[PDB]
Design a protein around this ligand. Structure first.
Ligand code: EGY
Ligand code: EGY
Ligand code: EGY
Ligand code: EGY
Ligand code: KZB
Ligand code: KZB
Ligand code: KZB
Ligand code: KZB
Ligand code: KZB
Ligand code: KZE
Ligand code: MG
Lengths: 108, 46, 33, 656, 76, 110
């Protein structure tokens, strides 16, 4: 596996696990309701898939940018790489904050 | 040797607080003597 | 005693100062002799 | 003036750690600042009473202590039925504070013990993370574990539970084990053994810990990085940990006989075999070598964590508790705001530079994350790992981008990244403060409505001062420790749940008609009955929403074959308290109780008289008479009702 | 901070210590000498010096340089 | 059929081992033999005092493990795996762990 395949498996596992898979299995939710209006601990399948995607994409943006710093790289391609990383990270963060605000009113 | 004999004595009469106190004292003394002796041994070895 | 709105402000200020100081420390650590 | 690099570095570290510890202790006490300082959630009242006993009777009387005030029909031995670490810590702190005359009551020490240990946890986390990499990551991890909301939820000022100290014990043991793997010395392994013994006595999660060290050793074996240091450290930890764990009284012979401590034994045998084979592979030439070439099962509260279907489908007393369901992503984000976005980066750094101690932190992270996904209550053990890894992650980014700067000895992208990271950190601080303030600090003894009505305490005080010295009161297992700590009377069931037949007996008594239940109560020698109603106050968690669980637990054990939980619903399968309700629910003893004289009390404006706030319904039986019970007391808002069980009829009449 | 309790003393790690002590001494002396020279030149050579206080400052600077040379030879 | 290799290995072991290591191996064999006789007795008569059997037995196992660890740390062929654990410090750690183990064993037996 050379310590990279294992990391890919861990990333996939982390995404899926933070999607509330165990919740779905143990307590079957309907796919899309009608975000629970007043229930913090409440997981529809679609909302959870979307959110765990945000978390994993944020981690990917960090590593994608962190890697960009490497030397002896062409500038035309490195600028694009840096752009992708910044976009992914900022979008993931701001989105997740907005989602949590919409689901749990009175936030902050 | 006194520490091991104390360990034996604890089993018959002394409870654990008294034995632990006695061990604290004897172990501190043995530690000082052992530090000195091991320093001397390391010098003689080299 | 001490009203909450005071404790919350104290905790916020202390935490922000703490994290900023930690970020500063990173700068100081990168630039070593 | 000018200072050396070493002096400024040391001053910065000291100042940061001092501020972090002060913040950790300060953030914990929100509830103490609001409501008066009292132990809450009625789980720690048992721990509190136990601590007081240890503080006023001694240890030898406490080690062998028999309690006759709980589970009256049976006997409860408190000296050997619970892990004693928290009580010992509190009593030691109390005696130290009393030697130098700083005289402080036991209650104040119990209330503020958890914030102190949460303050110690920060320093321990800093040293642990310093072992992993550059100190900067250590400072960052300390600062972040200071304000994490899950850890602050399970340990608040006024919450005297064992998880608080437990986490500090676990982090100390992990630090000792990492230092033993890196150093490879017997002394560090012995320190780890002593720390593990302390951890065994403090929390029930020691099993967990003893299934992560061997698994890591086994993982290291597969990789091929096994050396003499790991052999020495693990074997020395194993022997001493096994023995030290034995002599905890409650454990007994659990480690060598049970099935939760078999992974360690297997890894120990495998380690011996592997070391001997490696030694034999050197003394002989390759051709010669190639020529040569009754036990208990899982207990069940651990098994359900591996298979998250058993407890919910089979045992109706473990899944009855609230925080036993799986966690959702919303809860994950609520507990940790920016920590989740940094777990993958920490895992990437660890997987990029594999060391002899990195593998252990990766394993800890993974397994703990799974357990947090299979239970809410185990989110706790997830907060400590995350911080560390998150710290690392964030730290690395800073150290990567504070070297590209020109002032340090396009370039502005690094400055933009620094600004971005600072924004992330400050917004995490604000999120943690808000979550601590508005959600996690709350009392369970007082209902916050600003007007507060403490009906629970008033009822317990009446029961304490106006009953005979030997009166026996029976309630649900939830209100078990609370009665004994405040009401101070002999109780029948308790919140331990170590004899399901007794709790089933009480459930049958609460779920049957007045004749059969009167027979049960006479058999058990019960005098007063305490039932929470909460119909006027609108309390969702009353003793009528738990009635279904009472029926399920009671109609299970060999005598509730006539309970038949499907007999309390409507024909279509509803559970209504109105006229359309089941004719056996409206004549249950539980229904005769907590509805006496409730038919003619207005509780709303545009609503009929016999109205129930919590169920939003209309009582089925407006008027009824209690044949076998007198109303002994009822609080001001009708929240707690105490009924005095009657005698036999003098002239020997029926009195159904 | 006065108890060693060490068995095997490493002279290689003590050599670094007896170097750090010396370099701190020398840095203090050199910074103080530069400050003294600048202060004497600024407070004795405004408009009239008469080469008397300047000569005393030069003698003191020569003595300081000699002490620094002795310390440098000792550290060498 | 497998005796020639044993003869060779036994012959070789003696030449590549110093006096202290041979002495230690004798002590280790004594520990192993006492533990084996104790376990055999337990298998012969049974365990009414189970805690005493555990105490007396794990005393043997613990002394065996501490002896093996001391042997590993002393052997100069591993001088590159410790880097600071001098022989004297190794003996010190051995004494400390042995005192702890013997104290706990006494506190556990009847
Ligand atoms: C229900 C909960 C269950 C919890 C399961 C715990 C999961 C553990 C997570 C994985 C742990 C990662 C360990 C690890 O990093 O090992 C890696 C990659 O090499 C390997 O690890 C391959 C071996 C795979 C075993 C992984 C653990 C299995 C343990 C089961 C007992 C080392 O790669 P290697 O290539 O082996 O060594 C490095 C050599 N290089 C030249 C590549 C540098
Ligand atoms: C500051 C907070 C530190 C917390 C440490 C946590 C300690 C957990 C204690 C668990 C209690 C287990 C009960 C126990 O140990 O048994 C007690 C012995 O009674 C005792 O001695 C209790 C003292 C325990 C201290 C041992 C060192 C702990 C160090 C942990 C870091 C028996 O005492 P005795 O009655 O003396 O039995 C001896 C009789 N013989 C004839 C057999 C000799
Ligand atoms: C390591 C060995 C040494 C261990 C040292 C242990 C330190 C324990 C720290 C806890 C200190 C307890 C202080 C305290 O009790 O305050 C509480 C509630 O009053 C408050 O407002 C206090 C809240 C915040 C004060 C925290 C200060 C603690 C500082 C400790 C370093 C008082 O509760 P009450 O019972 O209401 O007292 C009022 C009674 N009167 C009649 C006096 C009015
Ligand atoms: C419960 C009581 C138990 C009694 C234990 C009996 C001890 C037997 C005495 C043997 C002699 C010990 C030798 C010794 O003390 O070594 C000590 C470090 O010490 C050790 O490694 C282990 C000694 C543990 C004894 C603790 C008693 C201390 C009491 C002091 C008041 C220092 O080792 P060094 O190798 O010198 O560490 C220096 C490392 N530098 C890199 C900094 C140089
Ligand atoms: C330096 C050596 C000196 C000898 C010794 O080891 C350390 O230190 C001795 C103690 O003094 C012990 C006695 C104490 C009084 C106690 C009275 C009881 O009555 C009796 O039953 C037991 C007895 C005599 C103890 C027996 C073991 C002794 C002799 C111990 C030895 C092993
Ligand atoms: C050379 C060493 C050998 C070991 C030791 O020191 C000197 O010699 C022991 C004595 O025999 C002491 C006991 C005397 C009787 C006394 C009876 C009380 O009753 C009891 O409370 C205390 C007790 C048993 C003493 C305790 C300390 C002992 C065991 C002493 C040891 C520390
Ligand atoms: C850190 C400093 C301060 C704390 C201290 O060391 C140095 O460590 C303390 C111990 O905990 C000791 C107590 C244990 C409980 C024991 C109960 C008895 O009842 C009582 O008689 C004595 C008493 C209180 C012990 C007195 C000495 C104490 C306070 C020791 C101090 C000297
Ligand atoms: C009741 C309170 C008591 C205090 C505390 O809370 C609960 O419980 C403490 C623990 O005991 C922790 C210490 C363990 C030992 C560890 C040794 C290291 O020493 C290194 O020193 C180098 C230079 O010589 C060497 O080269 C290295 O080999 C050697 O490891 C040191 O750095 C960190 C230290 C002291 C730990 C710090 C945090 C402590 C004090 C914890 C507190 C939070
Ligand atoms: C760190 C250490 C901790 C301790 C240990 O290693 C790692 O882990 C222990 C295991 O738990 C082992 C026990 C398992 C149960 C087994 C039952 C037998 O019961 C017999 O009872 C006879 C009566 O007549 C019948 O004749 C027989 O047929 C019948 O088998 C008993 O003899 C041996 C016993 C107790 C094992 C002994 C070795 C133990 C303690 C192991 C140690 C080496
Ligand atoms: C794979 C395999 C077969 C084994 C290795 C699995 C690993 C890593 C560990 C063993 C898993 C296990 C049984 C329990 C996990 C222990 C955890 C997470 C927390 C402690 C358990 C809770 C119930 C104690 C608090 O409860 P209380 O304090 O008592 O209220
Ligand atoms: Mg608990």
């Amino acid at each position: 596996p050379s310590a990279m395949t294992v990391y890919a498996l861990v990333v996939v596992s982390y995404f899926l696990i933070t999607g509330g898979i165990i919740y779905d299995v143990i307590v079957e939710p309907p796919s899309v309701g009608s975000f629970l209006a007043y229930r913090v601990n409440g997981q529809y399948i679609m909302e959870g898939l979307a959110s765990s995607f945000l978390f994993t994409m944020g981690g990917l943006g960090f590593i994608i940018l962190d890697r960009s710093n490497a030397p002896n790289i062409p500038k035309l391609n490195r600028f694009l790489l840096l752009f992708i990383g910044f976009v992914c990270v900022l979008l993931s963060f701001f989105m997740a904050r907005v989602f949590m605000r919409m689901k749990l009113p009175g936030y902050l | 040797a006194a520490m091991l004999g104390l360990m034996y004595v604890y089993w018959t009469q002394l409870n654990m607080f008294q034995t632990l106190k006695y061990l604290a004292i004897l172990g501190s003394v043995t530690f000082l003597a052992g530090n000195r002796m091991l320093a001397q041994q390391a010098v003689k070895r080299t | 005693m001490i009203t909450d709105v005071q404790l919350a402000i104290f905790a916020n200020m202390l935490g922000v100062s703490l994290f900023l100081l930690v970020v500063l420390y990173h700068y100081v650590a990168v630039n070593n002799p | 003036l000018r200072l050396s690099y070493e002096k400024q570095d040391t001053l910065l570290k000291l100042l940061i750690l001092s501020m972090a510890a002060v913040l950790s202790f300060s953030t914990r006490l929100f509830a103490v600042l609001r409501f008066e300082s009292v132990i809450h959630e009625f789980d720690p009242y048992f721990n509190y009473r136990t601590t007081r006993f240890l503080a006023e009777e001694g240890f030898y009387k406490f080690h062998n202590w028999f309690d006759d005030r709980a589970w009256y029909p049976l006997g409860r031995i408190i000296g050997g039925t619970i892990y004693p670490g928290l009580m010992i810590t509190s009593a030691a702190i109390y005696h130290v504070l009393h030697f130098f005359h700083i005289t402080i009551d036991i209650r104040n020490v119990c209330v503020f013990l958890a914030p102190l240990f949460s303050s110690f946890t920060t320093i321990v986390t800093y040293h642990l993370t310093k072992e992993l990499k550059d100190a900067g990551a250590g400072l960052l991890a300390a600062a972040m574990i200071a304000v994490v909301p899950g850890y602050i939820s399970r340990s608040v000022a006024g919450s005297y539970d064992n998880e608080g100290i437990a986490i500090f014990c676990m982090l100390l043991t992990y630090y000792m084990w990492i230092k033993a793997v890196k150093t490879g010395s017997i002394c560090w392994a012995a320190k780890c053994a002593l720390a593990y013994f302390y951890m065994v006595s403090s929390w029930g999660g020691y099993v967990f810990l003893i299934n992560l060290i061997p698994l890591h050793v086994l993982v290291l074996m597969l990789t091929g990085r096994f050396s003499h240091r790991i052999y020495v450290a693990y074997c020395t930890v194993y022997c001493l940990g096994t023995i030290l764990s034995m002599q905890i009284s409650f454990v007994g012979f659990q480690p060598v006989l049970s099935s939760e401590h078999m992974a360690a034994f297997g890894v120990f045998g495998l380690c011996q075999i592997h070391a001997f084979v490696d030694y034999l592979r050197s003394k002989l030439n390759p051709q010669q070598f190639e020529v040569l070439f009754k036990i208990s099962p899982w207990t069940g509260r651990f098994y359900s964590l591996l298979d998250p279907s058993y407890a919910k489908n089979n045992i109706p007393i473990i899944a009855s508790v609230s925080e036993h369901q799986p966690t959702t992503w919303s809860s994950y984000y609520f507990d940790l705001q920016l920590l989740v976005f940094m777990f993958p980066v920490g895992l990437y750094y660890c997987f990029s530079n594999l060391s002899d101690a990195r593998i252990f932190i990766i394993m800890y992270g993974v397994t703990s994350m799974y357990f947090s996904a299979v239970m809410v209550r185990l989110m706790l053990v997830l907060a400590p790992v995350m911080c560390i890894l998150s710290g690392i992650g964030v730290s690395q980014v800073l150290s990567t981008y504070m070297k590209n700067l020109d002032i340090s000895r396009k370039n502005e992208v690094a400055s933009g990244m620094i600004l971005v990271m600072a924004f992330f950190l400050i917004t995490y601080t604000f999120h943690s403060t808000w979550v601590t303030s508005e959600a996690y600090s709350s009392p369970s003894i007082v209902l916050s409505a600003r007007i507060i009505f403490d009906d629970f305490r008033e009822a317990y005080y009446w029961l304490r001062h106006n009953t005979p010295e030997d009166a026996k009161v029976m309630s649900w297992w939830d209100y078990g420790y609370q009665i004994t700590a405040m009401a101070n009377r002999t109780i029948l069931v308790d919140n331990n749940t170590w004899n399901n037949t007794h709790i089933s007996r009480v459930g049958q008594a609460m779920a049957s008609t007045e004749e059969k239940a009167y027979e049960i109560m006479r058999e058990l020698d019960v005098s007063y009955v305490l039932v929470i109603f909460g119909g006027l106050t609108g309390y969702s968690s009353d003793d009528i929403n738990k009635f279904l669980w009472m029926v399920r637990i009671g109609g299970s054990t060999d005598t509730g074959k006539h309970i038949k939980e499907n007999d309390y619903y409507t024909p279509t399968g509803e559970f209504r308290v109105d006229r359309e309700g089941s004719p056996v629910l409206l004549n249950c003893l539980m229904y005769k109780m907590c509805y006496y004289r409730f038919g003619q009390v207005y509780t709303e404006a545009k609503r009929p008289p016999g109205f129930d706030r919590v169920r939003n319904a209309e009582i089925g039986n407006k008027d009824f008479e209690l044949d076998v019970l007198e109303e002994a007391y009822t609080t001001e808002h009708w929240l707690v009702r105490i009924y005095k069980v009657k005698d036999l009829d003098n002239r020997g009449l029926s009195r159904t | 901070v006065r108890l060693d309790f060490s068995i095997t003393k490493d002279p290689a790690a003590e050599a670094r210590m007896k170097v750090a002590c010396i370099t701190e001494q020398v840095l203090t002396l050199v910074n103080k000498r530069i400050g003294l020279y600048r202060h004497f030149d600024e407070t004795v050579n405004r408009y009239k010096q008469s080469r008397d206080i300047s000569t005393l400052n030069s003698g003191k600077k020569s003595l300081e340089t000699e002490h620094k040379a002795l310390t440098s030879e000792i550290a060498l | 059929s497998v005796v020639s290799v044993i003869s060779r290995f036994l012959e070789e072991y003696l030449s590549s081992t110093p006096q202290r290591l041979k002495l230690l191996d004798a002590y280790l064999l004594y520990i192993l033999l006492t533990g084996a006789l104790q376990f055999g007795y337990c298998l012969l008569v049974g365990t009414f005092p189970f805690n005493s059997f555990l105490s007396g037995f794990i005393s043997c196992v613990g002394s065996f493990i501490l002896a093996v660890c001391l042997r590993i740390q002393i052997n100069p062929q591993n001088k590159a795996d410790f880097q600071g654990i001098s022989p004297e410090r190794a003996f010190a750690d051995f004494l400390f762990a042995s005192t702890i183990l013997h104290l706990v064993v006494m506190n556990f037996v009847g």
